[PDB]
Amino acid sequence: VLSEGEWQLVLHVWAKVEADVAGHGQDILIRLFKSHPETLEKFDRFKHLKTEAEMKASEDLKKHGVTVLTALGAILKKKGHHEAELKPLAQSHATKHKIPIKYLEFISEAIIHVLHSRHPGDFGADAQGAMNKALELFRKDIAAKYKELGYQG
Ligand code: HEM
């Protein structure tokens, strides 16, 4: 579990992400796509984008970045009591989108990378550690749902 103090660190940086959800969403997905190109293959909707400039110009990509960060934010704000929000997400990702747990680890790394770039002052080592723990709790809870359904990873 995270402590109250670690949750505070997480939500404090998150409040900053909220100031520009679209810009953060975009940078996160692009980082994911460039670092792990196999991830882009899971999106029929974005597969035609070849360059970072084409990605940056895509308004639909920016819209999806907002969707992703919006769902993540609702999870974080529950501070671990996220069963209702997590359940539907795990089911679509496992059964409909077919996203391995490892890709969830890759997007976690992209979030951390971006947060680092845009929020140095609010994103020191202590905050980075808390954010990591929160994202691991998220992945651990999702992984359990996947296991139940027969997709473990
Ligand atoms: C931070 C972790 C993630 C969050 C919170 C998240 C959230 C969402 C949401 C809220 C949706 C739309 C509703 C739905 O279908 O459930 C969605 C759709 C989808 N997600 Fe995720 N997602 C995450 C990770 C990923 C990653 C790692 C991938 C691929 C590598 C993935 C691929 C998909 C695809 C393929 C769709 C359908 C997009 C479309 O065509 O409309 N997601 N995601």
Side-chain angles (χ1 to χ4, degrees):
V1 336
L2 273 79
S3 60
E4 193 78 37
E6 288 167 320
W7 277 117
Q8 283 174 209
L9 295 167
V10 173
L11 295 174
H12 175 88
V13 76
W14 203 256
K16 299 329 183 127
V17 172
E18 285 189 337
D20 185 0
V21 187
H24 283 84
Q26 203 187 200
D27 285 353
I28 290 171
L29 294 177
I30 287 169
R31 168 61 161 210
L32 181 58
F33 301 152
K34 281 189 61 219
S35 296
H36 306 281
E38 68 272 36
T39 62
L40 176 56
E41 222 48 18
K42 289 292 185 179
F43 290 88
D44 278 331
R45 88 197 251 216
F46 297 129
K47 285 209 284 185
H48 60 291
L49 306 162
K50 268 205 233 167
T51 74
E52 174 162 10
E54 278 169 358
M55 291 173 194
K56 264 169 232 268
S58 176
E59 181 75 10
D60 195 46
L61 181 51
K62 182 164 171 212
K63 260 170 70 183
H64 192 58
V66 169
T67 292
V68 175
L69 296 194
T70 290
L72 185 69
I75 288 157
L76 294 184
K77 292 162 183 174
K78 287 293 175 164
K79 294 161 72 186
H81 296 107
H82 50 224
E83 311 89 4
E85 300 73 2
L86 219 161
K87 216 165 132 205
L89 196 177
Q91 314 186 130
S92 59
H93 289 61
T95 82
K96 191 155 129 240
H97 304 317
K98 294 309 187 349
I99 308 311
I101 289 292
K102 186 77 182 168
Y103 288 13
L104 302 175
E105 180 184 349
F106 297 159
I107 198 169
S108 294
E109 288 308 307
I111 289 173
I112 280 162
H113 185 75
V114 170
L115 278 205
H116 194 69
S117 309
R118 298 182 59 136
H119 315 261
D122 275 317
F123 210 63
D126 60 332
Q128 179 183 353
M131 185 67 66
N132 199 71
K133 274 189 166 194
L135 292 176
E136 281 188 315
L137 174 62
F138 163 77
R139 288 211 288 292
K140 163 187 121 93
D141 283 353
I142 282 232
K145 266 48 92 195
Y146 268 46
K147 192 183 161 66
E148 181 179 332
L149 300 165
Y151 291 78
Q152 180 71 303

Tab-separated table of all heavy atoms in Angstrom, residues 81-142:
chain	number	residue	atom	x	y	z
A	81	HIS	N	-8.489	2.631	-3.728
A	81	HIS	CA	-9.814	2.007	-3.659
A	81	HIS	C	-10.471	2.107	-5.018
A	81	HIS	O	-11.497	2.752	-5.143
A	81	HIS	CB	-10.646	2.791	-2.612
A	81	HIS	CG	-10.048	2.655	-1.239
A	81	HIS	ND1	-9.383	3.720	-0.669
A	81	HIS	CD2	-9.988	1.612	-0.384
A	81	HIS	CE1	-8.952	3.330	0.508
A	81	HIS	NE2	-9.292	2.068	0.706
A	82	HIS	N	-9.838	1.523	-6.010
A	82	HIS	CA	-10.232	1.727	-7.400
A	82	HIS	C	-10.873	0.557	-8.077
A	82	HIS	O	-10.909	0.484	-9.284
A	82	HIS	CB	-8.929	2.124	-8.150
A	82	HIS	CG	-7.729	1.208	-7.923
A	82	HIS	ND1	-6.466	1.710	-7.681
A	82	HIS	CD2	-7.640	-0.160	-7.860
A	82	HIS	CE1	-5.658	0.662	-7.505
A	82	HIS	NE2	-6.322	-0.478	-7.616
A	83	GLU	N	-11.409	-0.360	-7.308
A	83	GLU	CA	-12.041	-1.525	-7.893
A	83	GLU	C	-13.087	-1.201	-8.962
A	83	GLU	O	-13.060	-1.734	-10.059
A	83	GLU	CB	-12.620	-2.385	-6.770
A	83	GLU	CG	-11.552	-2.595	-5.659
A	83	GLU	CD	-11.444	-1.597	-4.526
A	83	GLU	OE1	-12.288	-0.652	-4.460
A	83	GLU	OE2	-10.500	-1.785	-3.692
A	84	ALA	N	-14.010	-0.293	-8.701
A	84	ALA	CA	-14.995	-0.015	-9.724
A	84	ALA	C	-14.432	0.547	-11.013
A	84	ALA	O	-14.951	0.292	-12.088
A	84	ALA	CB	-16.039	0.943	-9.187
A	85	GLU	N	-13.400	1.363	-10.928
A	85	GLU	CA	-12.866	1.957	-12.144
A	85	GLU	C	-11.922	1.013	-12.879
A	85	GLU	O	-11.777	1.029	-14.094
A	85	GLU	CB	-12.115	3.242	-11.745
A	85	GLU	CG	-13.005	4.298	-11.031
A	85	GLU	CD	-13.405	3.984	-9.595
A	85	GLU	OE1	-12.991	2.928	-9.038
A	85	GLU	OE2	-14.171	4.792	-9.018
A	86	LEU	N	-11.236	0.159	-12.138
A	86	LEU	CA	-10.230	-0.692	-12.723
A	86	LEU	C	-10.809	-1.825	-13.489
A	86	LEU	O	-10.353	-2.203	-14.565
A	86	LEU	CB	-9.235	-1.215	-11.657
A	86	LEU	CG	-7.765	-1.295	-12.038
A	86	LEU	CD1	-6.858	-1.363	-10.815
A	86	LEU	CD2	-7.670	-2.643	-12.710
A	87	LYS	N	-11.872	-2.382	-12.945
A	87	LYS	CA	-12.519	-3.565	-13.548
A	87	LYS	C	-12.899	-3.512	-15.001
A	87	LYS	O	-12.565	-4.378	-15.816
A	87	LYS	CB	-13.706	-4.073	-12.780
A	87	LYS	CG	-13.759	-5.570	-12.853
A	87	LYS	CD	-14.699	-6.146	-11.827
A	87	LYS	CE	-15.616	-7.152	-12.470
A	87	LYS	NZ	-16.871	-7.283	-11.706
A	88	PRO	N	-13.581	-2.451	-15.396
A	88	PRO	CA	-13.941	-2.344	-16.786
A	88	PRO	C	-12.714	-2.164	-17.705
A	88	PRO	O	-12.628	-2.627	-18.844
A	88	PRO	CB	-14.848	-1.113	-16.867
A	88	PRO	CG	-15.226	-0.728	-15.469
A	88	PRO	CD	-14.312	-1.502	-14.537
A	89	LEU	N	-11.727	-1.453	-17.209
A	89	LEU	CA	-10.532	-1.188	-17.962
A	89	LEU	C	-9.766	-2.496	-18.173
A	89	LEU	O	-9.264	-2.833	-19.260
A	89	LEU	CB	-9.757	-0.107	-17.143
A	89	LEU	CG	-8.663	0.603	-17.904
A	89	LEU	CD1	-8.112	1.640	-16.948
A	89	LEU	CD2	-7.531	-0.352	-18.173
A	90	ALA	N	-9.697	-3.304	-17.135
A	90	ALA	CA	-8.958	-4.570	-17.287
A	90	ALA	C	-9.651	-5.470	-18.252
A	90	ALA	O	-9.071	-6.136	-19.109
A	90	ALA	CB	-8.799	-5.315	-15.957
A	91	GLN	N	-10.959	-5.524	-18.140
A	91	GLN	CA	-11.676	-6.378	-19.095
A	91	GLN	C	-11.537	-5.947	-20.551
A	91	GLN	O	-11.347	-6.772	-21.426
A	91	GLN	CB	-13.184	-6.512	-18.746
A	91	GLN	CG	-13.402	-6.785	-17.244
A	91	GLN	CD	-14.862	-7.065	-16.939
A	91	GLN	OE1	-15.222	-8.047	-16.280
A	91	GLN	NE2	-15.736	-6.240	-17.511
A	92	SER	N	-11.645	-4.654	-20.883
A	92	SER	CA	-11.496	-4.355	-22.280
A	92	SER	C	-10.096	-4.576	-22.748
A	92	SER	O	-9.864	-5.024	-23.889
A	92	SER	CB	-11.898	-2.951	-22.675
A	92	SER	OG	-11.114	-2.049	-21.946
A	93	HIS	N	-9.126	-4.168	-21.895
A	93	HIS	CA	-7.726	-4.336	-22.338
A	93	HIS	C	-7.255	-5.790	-22.529
A	93	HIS	O	-6.485	-6.151	-23.414
A	93	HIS	CB	-6.770	-3.448	-21.529
A	93	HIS	CG	-6.981	-1.991	-21.905
A	93	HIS	ND1	-8.191	-1.350	-21.726
A	93	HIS	CD2	-6.116	-1.052	-22.447
A	93	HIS	CE1	-8.052	-0.099	-22.151
A	93	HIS	NE2	-6.816	0.131	-22.571
A	94	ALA	N	-7.783	-6.662	-21.703
A	94	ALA	CA	-7.418	-8.049	-21.829
A	94	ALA	C	-8.181	-8.688	-22.966
A	94	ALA	O	-7.626	-9.379	-23.800
A	94	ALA	CB	-7.868	-8.812	-20.564
A	95	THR	N	-9.486	-8.518	-22.948
A	95	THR	CA	-10.269	-9.270	-23.917
A	95	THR	C	-10.581	-8.676	-25.238
A	95	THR	O	-10.801	-9.396	-26.183
A	95	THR	CB	-11.554	-9.781	-23.262
A	95	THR	OG1	-12.519	-8.735	-23.253
A	95	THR	CG2	-11.213	-10.237	-21.829
A	96	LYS	N	-10.657	-7.377	-25.303
A	96	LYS	CA	-10.981	-6.727	-26.555
A	96	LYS	C	-9.740	-6.151	-27.176
A	96	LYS	O	-9.418	-6.423	-28.318
A	96	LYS	CB	-11.937	-5.626	-26.185
A	96	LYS	CG	-12.648	-4.919	-27.336
A	96	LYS	CD	-13.956	-4.329	-26.783
A	96	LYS	CE	-14.171	-2.851	-27.097
A	96	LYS	NZ	-14.287	-2.000	-25.898
A	97	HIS	N	-8.980	-5.358	-26.424
A	97	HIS	CA	-7.787	-4.812	-27.057
A	97	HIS	C	-6.613	-5.755	-27.128
A	97	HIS	O	-5.730	-5.604	-27.950
A	97	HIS	CB	-7.381	-3.548	-26.290
A	97	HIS	CG	-8.541	-2.592	-26.254
A	97	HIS	ND1	-9.325	-2.350	-27.372
A	97	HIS	CD2	-9.056	-1.891	-25.220
A	97	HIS	CE1	-10.285	-1.511	-26.945
A	97	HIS	NE2	-10.144	-1.205	-25.664
A	98	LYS	N	-6.573	-6.725	-26.244
A	98	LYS	CA	-5.474	-7.694	-26.220
A	98	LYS	C	-4.096	-7.098	-25.925
A	98	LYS	O	-3.142	-7.295	-26.704
A	98	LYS	CB	-5.398	-8.495	-27.496
A	98	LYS	CG	-6.624	-9.401	-27.657
A	98	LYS	CD	-6.877	-10.243	-26.414
A	98	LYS	CE	-7.979	-11.252	-26.607
A	98	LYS	NZ	-8.739	-10.965	-27.910
A	99	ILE	N	-4.038	-6.403	-24.794
A	99	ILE	CA	-2.858	-5.733	-24.324
A	99	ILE	C	-2.187	-6.557	-23.235
A	99	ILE	O	-2.718	-6.703	-22.128
A	99	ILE	CB	-3.217	-4.353	-23.773
A	99	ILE	CG1	-4.060	-3.511	-24.764
A	99	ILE	CG2	-1.986	-3.565	-23.280
A	99	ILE	CD1	-3.509	-3.449	-26.180
A	100	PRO	N	-0.969	-7.007	-23.533
A	100	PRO	CA	-0.215	-7.763	-22.551
A	100	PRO	C	0.133	-6.883	-21.385
A	100	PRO	O	0.315	-5.698	-21.568
A	100	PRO	CB	1.052	-8.244	-23.270
A	100	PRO	CG	1.009	-7.759	-24.703
A	100	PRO	CD	-0.277	-6.949	-24.864
A	101	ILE	N	0.256	-7.445	-20.169
A	101	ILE	CA	0.663	-6.677	-18.995
A	101	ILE	C	1.974	-5.975	-19.224
A	101	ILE	O	2.167	-4.901	-18.712
A	101	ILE	CB	0.833	-7.651	-17.805
A	101	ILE	CG1	-0.563	-8.088	-17.444
A	101	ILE	CG2	1.353	-6.935	-16.566
A	101	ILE	CD1	-1.347	-6.915	-16.872
A	102	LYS	N	2.896	-6.563	-20.013
A	102	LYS	CA	4.168	-5.883	-20.221
A	102	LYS	C	4.025	-4.490	-20.854
A	102	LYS	O	4.807	-3.572	-20.609
A	102	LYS	CB	5.001	-6.741	-21.159
A	102	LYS	CG	6.421	-6.253	-21.368
A	102	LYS	CD	7.259	-6.614	-20.148
A	102	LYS	CE	8.694	-6.159	-20.178
A	102	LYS	NZ	9.335	-6.272	-18.918
A	103	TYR	N	3.041	-4.336	-21.733
A	103	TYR	CA	2.828	-3.026	-22.372
A	103	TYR	C	2.357	-2.025	-21.336
A	103	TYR	O	2.528	-0.830	-21.480
A	103	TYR	CB	1.738	-3.080	-23.457
A	103	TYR	CG	2.146	-3.813	-24.713
A	103	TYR	CD1	3.293	-4.605	-24.721
A	103	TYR	CD2	1.366	-3.716	-25.861
A	103	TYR	CE1	3.681	-5.299	-25.862
A	103	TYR	CE2	1.725	-4.397	-27.018
A	103	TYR	CZ	2.882	-5.176	-27.001
A	103	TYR	OH	3.295	-5.833	-28.125
A	104	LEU	N	1.699	-2.498	-20.298
A	104	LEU	CA	1.288	-1.585	-19.259
A	104	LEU	C	2.524	-1.091	-18.501
A	104	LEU	O	2.615	0.050	-17.999
A	104	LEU	CB	0.203	-2.137	-18.316
A	104	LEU	CG	-1.059	-2.559	-19.059
A	104	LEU	CD1	-1.995	-3.194	-18.046
A	104	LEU	CD2	-1.793	-1.314	-19.468
A	105	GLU	N	3.533	-1.956	-18.415
A	105	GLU	CA	4.767	-1.536	-17.813
A	105	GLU	C	5.450	-0.455	-18.699
A	105	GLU	O	6.046	0.551	-18.242
A	105	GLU	CB	5.692	-2.790	-17.703
A	105	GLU	CG	7.015	-2.390	-17.068
A	105	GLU	CD	7.999	-3.536	-17.020
A	105	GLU	OE1	7.625	-4.713	-17.284
A	105	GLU	OE2	9.167	-3.255	-16.665
A	106	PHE	N	5.383	-0.652	-20.020
A	106	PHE	CA	6.024	0.335	-20.918
A	106	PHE	C	5.347	1.702	-20.822
A	106	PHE	O	6.022	2.717	-20.793
A	106	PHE	CB	5.905	-0.051	-22.400
A	106	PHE	CG	6.598	-1.344	-22.762
A	106	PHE	CD1	6.222	-2.042	-23.907
A	106	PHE	CD2	7.707	-1.796	-22.038
A	106	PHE	CE1	6.877	-3.228	-24.245
A	106	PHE	CE2	8.418	-2.942	-22.403
A	106	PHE	CZ	7.974	-3.666	-23.502
A	107	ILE	N	4.001	1.743	-20.781
A	107	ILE	CA	3.316	3.048	-20.690
A	107	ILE	C	3.626	3.720	-19.340
A	107	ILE	O	3.745	4.949	-19.242
A	107	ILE	CB	1.804	3.002	-21.045
A	107	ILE	CG1	1.313	4.459	-21.354
A	107	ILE	CG2	1.001	2.448	-19.836
A	107	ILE	CD1	-0.084	4.439	-21.980
A	108	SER	N	3.766	2.898	-18.279
A	108	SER	CA	4.152	3.414	-16.964
A	108	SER	C	5.477	4.163	-17.064
A	108	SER	O	5.639	5.245	-16.522
A	108	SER	CB	4.343	2.292	-15.947
A	108	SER	OG	3.054	1.732	-15.760
A	109	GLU	N	6.437	3.563	-17.734
A	109	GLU	CA	7.769	4.169	-17.922
A	109	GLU	C	7.662	5.468	-18.697
A	109	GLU	O	8.329	6.440	-18.362
A	109	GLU	CB	8.746	3.210	-18.613
A	109	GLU	CG	9.180	2.044	-17.661
A	109	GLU	CD	9.710	2.459	-16.282
A	109	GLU	OE1	10.660	3.328	-16.247
A	109	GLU	OE2	9.186	1.922	-15.229
A	110	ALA	N	6.783	5.500	-19.704
A	110	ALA	CA	6.587	6.723	-20.515
A	110	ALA	C	5.986	7.831	-19.675
A	110	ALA	O	6.286	9.009	-19.863
A	110	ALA	CB	5.704	6.478	-21.748
A	111	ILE	N	5.070	7.469	-18.762
A	111	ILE	CA	4.428	8.491	-17.925
A	111	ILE	C	5.469	9.143	-17.041
A	111	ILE	O	5.583	10.366	-16.894
A	111	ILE	CB	3.333	7.808	-17.075
A	111	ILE	CG1	2.194	7.424	-18.019
A	111	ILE	CG2	2.794	8.777	-16.026
A	111	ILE	CD1	1.150	6.587	-17.270
A	112	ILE	N	6.270	8.268	-16.436
A	112	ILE	CA	7.331	8.749	-15.553
A	112	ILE	C	8.319	9.643	-16.336
A	112	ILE	O	8.632	10.737	-15.888
A	112	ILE	CB	7.976	7.557	-14.825
A	112	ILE	CG1	7.039	7.194	-13.664
A	112	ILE	CG2	9.326	7.933	-14.230
A	112	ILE	CD1	7.345	5.790	-13.167
A	113	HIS	N	8.758	9.206	-17.514
A	113	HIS	CA	9.649	10.006	-18.332
A	113	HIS	C	9.077	11.401	-18.635
A	113	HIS	O	9.702	12.447	-18.562
A	113	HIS	CB	9.863	9.306	-19.675
A	113	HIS	CG	10.858	10.071	-20.463
A	113	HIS	ND1	12.202	10.021	-20.155
A	113	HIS	CD2	10.683	10.920	-21.498
A	113	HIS	CE1	12.822	10.819	-20.997
A	113	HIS	NE2	11.934	11.365	-21.813
A	114	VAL	N	7.831	11.446	-19.021
A	114	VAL	CA	7.234	12.723	-19.348
A	114	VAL	C	7.094	13.599	-18.134
A	114	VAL	O	7.304	14.792	-18.236
A	114	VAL	CB	5.901	12.593	-20.167
A	114	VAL	CG1	5.154	13.914	-20.312
A	114	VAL	CG2	6.175	12.007	-21.557
A	115	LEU	N	6.641	13.047	-17.020
A	115	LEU	CA	6.405	13.817	-15.835
A	115	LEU	C	7.701	14.487	-15.431
A	115	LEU	O	7.742	15.660	-15.020
A	115	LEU	CB	5.863	12.927	-14.703
A	115	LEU	CG	4.365	12.642	-14.764
A	115	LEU	CD1	3.742	12.314	-13.401
A	115	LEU	CD2	3.654	13.745	-15.500
A	116	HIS	N	8.767	13.738	-15.632
A	116	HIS	CA	10.102	14.204	-15.291
A	116	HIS	C	10.464	15.413	-16.094
A	116	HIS	O	10.956	16.367	-15.535
A	116	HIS	CB	11.246	13.162	-15.296
A	116	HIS	CG	12.518	13.628	-14.632
A	116	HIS	ND1	12.638	13.845	-13.265
A	116	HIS	CD2	13.717	13.948	-15.186
A	116	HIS	CE1	13.867	14.289	-13.016
A	116	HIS	NE2	14.546	14.352	-14.158
A	117	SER	N	10.234	15.330	-17.395
A	117	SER	CA	10.524	16.424	-18.305
A	117	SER	C	9.733	17.711	-18.090
A	117	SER	O	10.218	18.796	-18.311
A	117	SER	CB	10.205	16.040	-19.714
A	117	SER	OG	10.843	14.813	-19.976
A	118	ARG	N	8.482	17.605	-17.712
A	118	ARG	CA	7.624	18.748	-17.548
A	118	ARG	C	7.493	19.234	-16.101
A	118	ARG	O	6.965	20.302	-15.817
A	118	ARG	CB	6.270	18.347	-18.206
A	118	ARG	CG	6.418	18.060	-19.705
A	118	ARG	CD	5.136	17.694	-20.459
A	118	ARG	NE	4.101	18.718	-20.400
A	118	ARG	CZ	3.357	19.145	-21.424
A	118	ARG	NH1	3.499	18.666	-22.658
A	118	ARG	NH2	2.459	20.108	-21.178
A	119	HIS	N	7.949	18.458	-15.139
A	119	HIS	CA	7.760	18.940	-13.800
A	119	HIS	C	8.871	18.639	-12.829
A	119	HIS	O	8.600	18.147	-11.736
A	119	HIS	CB	6.433	18.547	-13.173
A	119	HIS	CG	5.324	18.748	-14.124
A	119	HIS	ND1	4.550	19.883	-14.040
A	119	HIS	CD2	4.884	17.959	-15.144
A	119	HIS	CE1	3.622	19.779	-14.986
A	119	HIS	NE2	3.782	18.619	-15.629
A	120	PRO	N	10.094	18.964	-13.233
A	120	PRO	CA	11.281	18.827	-12.396
A	120	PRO	C	11.034	19.203	-10.914
A	120	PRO	O	11.052	18.344	-10.028
A	120	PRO	CB	12.352	19.710	-13.065
A	120	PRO	CG	11.762	20.245	-14.365
A	120	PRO	CD	10.432	19.538	-14.560
A	121	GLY	N	10.703	20.457	-10.650
A	121	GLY	CA	10.435	20.949	-9.312
A	121	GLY	C	9.371	20.223	-8.525
A	121	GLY	O	9.321	20.307	-7.297
A	122	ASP	N	8.483	19.525	-9.196
A	122	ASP	CA	7.493	18.874	-8.358
A	122	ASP	C	7.749	17.401	-8.451
A	122	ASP	O	7.071	16.585	-7.807
A	122	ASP	CB	6.035	19.196	-8.753
A	122	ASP	CG	5.504	20.458	-8.150
A	122	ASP	OD1	5.765	20.682	-6.931
A	122	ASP	OD2	4.881	21.232	-8.939
A	123	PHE	N	8.777	17.126	-9.262
A	123	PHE	CA	9.030	15.729	-9.527
A	123	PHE	C	10.399	15.247	-9.124
A	123	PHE	O	11.200	14.793	-9.942
A	123	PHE	CB	8.606	15.327	-10.977
A	123	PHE	CG	8.161	13.865	-11.088
A	123	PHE	CD1	7.054	13.336	-10.415
A	123	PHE	CD2	8.884	12.997	-11.906
A	123	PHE	CE1	6.681	11.996	-10.564
A	123	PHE	CE2	8.512	11.661	-12.088
A	123	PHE	CZ	7.414	11.147	-11.393
A	124	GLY	N	10.683	15.387	-7.850
A	124	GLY	CA	11.967	14.911	-7.389
A	124	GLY	C	11.895	13.409	-7.097
A	124	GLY	O	10.852	12.808	-7.328
A	125	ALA	N	13.005	12.838	-6.611
A	125	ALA	CA	13.186	11.433	-6.304
A	125	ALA	C	12.099	10.863	-5.435
A	125	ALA	O	11.647	9.738	-5.707
A	125	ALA	CB	14.566	11.116	-5.711
A	126	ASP	N	11.697	11.605	-4.414
A	126	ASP	CA	10.668	11.158	-3.501
A	126	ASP	C	9.322	10.991	-4.237
A	126	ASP	O	8.607	10.022	-4.019
A	126	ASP	CB	10.568	12.112	-2.300
A	126	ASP	CG	10.231	13.552	-2.653
A	126	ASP	OD1	10.557	14.035	-3.782
A	126	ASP	OD2	9.688	14.221	-1.728
A	127	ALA	N	8.991	11.946	-5.118
A	127	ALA	CA	7.769	11.922	-5.897
A	127	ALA	C	7.863	10.845	-6.971
A	127	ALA	O	6.915	10.148	-7.330
A	127	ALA	CB	7.620	13.283	-6.571
A	128	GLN	N	9.039	10.683	-7.536
A	128	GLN	CA	9.194	9.666	-8.564
A	128	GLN	C	8.964	8.292	-7.967
A	128	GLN	O	8.297	7.446	-8.546
A	128	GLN	CB	10.555	9.801	-9.289
A	128	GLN	CG	10.798	8.740	-10.372
A	128	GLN	CD	12.178	8.908	-10.986
A	128	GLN	OE1	12.908	9.895	-10.697
A	128	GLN	NE2	12.585	7.917	-11.755
A	129	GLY	N	9.505	8.085	-6.775
A	129	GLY	CA	9.295	6.783	-6.121
A	129	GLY	C	7.813	6.505	-5.802
A	129	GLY	O	7.311	5.392	-5.983
A	130	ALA	N	7.102	7.526	-5.315
A	130	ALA	CA	5.700	7.397	-4.993
A	130	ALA	C	4.906	7.112	-6.273
A	130	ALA	O	4.039	6.228	-6.282
A	130	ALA	CB	5.184	8.656	-4.325
A	131	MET	N	5.263	7.819	-7.361
A	131	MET	CA	4.541	7.607	-8.614
A	131	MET	C	4.744	6.178	-9.121
A	131	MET	O	3.862	5.469	-9.623
A	131	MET	CB	4.899	8.639	-9.678
A	131	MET	CG	4.038	8.483	-10.946
A	131	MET	SD	2.247	8.854	-10.756
A	131	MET	CE	2.556	10.588	-10.424
A	132	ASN	N	5.952	5.720	-8.964
A	132	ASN	CA	6.249	4.360	-9.392
A	132	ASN	C	5.430	3.352	-8.645
A	132	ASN	O	4.918	2.412	-9.232
A	132	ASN	CB	7.715	4.032	-9.117
A	132	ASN	CG	8.102	2.845	-9.959
A	132	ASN	OD1	8.216	2.957	-11.192
A	132	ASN	ND2	8.207	1.683	-9.315
A	133	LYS	N	5.345	3.527	-7.332
A	133	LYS	CA	4.585	2.620	-6.488
A	133	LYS	C	3.107	2.612	-6.842
A	133	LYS	O	2.442	1.580	-6.785
A	133	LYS	CB	4.616	3.082	-5.049
A	133	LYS	CG	5.807	2.628	-4.189
A	133	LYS	CD	5.526	3.011	-2.718
A	133	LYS	CE	6.400	2.381	-1.618
A	133	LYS	NZ	5.910	2.513	-0.216
A	134	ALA	N	2.570	3.767	-7.173
A	134	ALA	CA	1.163	3.903	-7.567
A	134	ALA	C	0.907	3.179	-8.885
A	134	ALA	O	-0.154	2.525	-9.057
A	134	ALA	CB	0.712	5.370	-7.700
A	135	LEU	N	1.837	3.334	-9.829
A	135	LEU	CA	1.674	2.684	-11.122
A	135	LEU	C	1.852	1.180	-10.956
A	135	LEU	O	1.334	0.407	-11.715
A	135	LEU	CB	2.638	3.251	-12.166
A	135	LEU	CG	2.222	4.708	-12.470
A	135	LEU	CD1	3.214	5.370	-13.429
A	135	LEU	CD2	0.812	4.668	-13.034
A	136	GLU	N	2.641	0.762	-9.985
A	136	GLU	CA	2.828	-0.687	-9.814
A	136	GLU	C	1.571	-1.235	-9.175
A	136	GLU	O	1.231	-2.382	-9.438
A	136	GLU	CB	3.970	-0.982	-8.812
A	136	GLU	CG	5.294	-0.797	-9.543
A	136	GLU	CD	6.361	-1.272	-8.618
A	136	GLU	OE1	6.282	-0.893	-7.428
A	136	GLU	OE2	7.049	-2.250	-8.995
A	137	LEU	N	0.953	-0.474	-8.292
A	137	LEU	CA	-0.264	-0.960	-7.659
A	137	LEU	C	-1.334	-1.131	-8.742
A	137	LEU	O	-2.101	-2.109	-8.787
A	137	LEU	CB	-0.740	0.087	-6.625
A	137	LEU	CG	-2.112	-0.217	-5.974
A	137	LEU	CD1	-2.110	-1.528	-5.169
A	137	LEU	CD2	-2.559	0.926	-5.071
A	138	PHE	N	-1.360	-0.172	-9.673
A	138	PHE	CA	-2.306	-0.204	-10.779
A	138	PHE	C	-2.107	-1.455	-11.593
A	138	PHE	O	-3.035	-2.179	-11.877
A	138	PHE	CB	-2.058	1.053	-11.629
A	138	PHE	CG	-2.624	1.044	-13.025
A	138	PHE	CD1	-3.982	1.260	-13.243
A	138	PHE	CD2	-1.816	0.893	-14.143
A	138	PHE	CE1	-4.528	1.314	-14.526
A	138	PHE	CE2	-2.333	0.924	-15.437
A	138	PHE	CZ	-3.695	1.133	-15.627
A	139	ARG	N	-0.850	-1.751	-11.956
A	139	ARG	CA	-0.527	-2.923	-12.776
A	139	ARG	C	-0.771	-4.207	-12.011
A	139	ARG	O	-1.181	-5.223	-12.590
A	139	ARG	CB	0.971	-2.965	-13.069
A	139	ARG	CG	1.482	-1.942	-14.035
A	139	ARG	CD	2.675	-2.536	-14.784
A	139	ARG	NE	3.887	-2.674	-13.999
A	139	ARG	CZ	4.565	-1.641	-13.578
A	139	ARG	NH1	4.133	-0.399	-13.839
A	139	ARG	NH2	5.678	-1.874	-12.896
A	140	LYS	N	-0.516	-4.189	-10.699
A	140	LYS	CA	-0.695	-5.413	-9.959
A	140	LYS	C	-2.164	-5.790	-9.905
A	140	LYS	O	-2.531	-6.966	-10.047
A	140	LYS	CB	-0.141	-5.215	-8.579
A	140	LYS	CG	-0.612	-6.237	-7.589
A	140	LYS	CD	-0.143	-5.848	-6.191
A	140	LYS	CE	-1.303	-5.673	-5.231
A	140	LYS	NZ	-1.591	-6.910	-4.496
A	141	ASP	N	-3.023	-4.787	-9.704
A	141	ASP	CA	-4.475	-5.008	-9.636
A	141	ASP	C	-5.016	-5.428	-11.011
A	141	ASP	O	-5.879	-6.293	-11.139
A	141	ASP	CB	-5.206	-3.785	-9.055
A	141	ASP	CG	-5.049	-3.732	-7.566
A	141	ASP	OD1	-4.513	-4.680	-6.984
A	141	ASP	OD2	-5.507	-2.770	-6.926
A	142	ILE	N	-4.505	-4.826	-12.088
A	142	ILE	CA	-4.949	-5.202	-13.421
A	142	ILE	C	-4.519	-6.656	-13.709
A	142	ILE	O	-5.247	-7.462	-14.254
A	142	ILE	CB	-4.342	-4.229	-14.469
A	142	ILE	CG1	-5.111	-2.897	-14.486
A	142	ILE	CG2	-4.326	-4.872	-15.851
A	142	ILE	CD1	-5.580	-2.442	-15.857
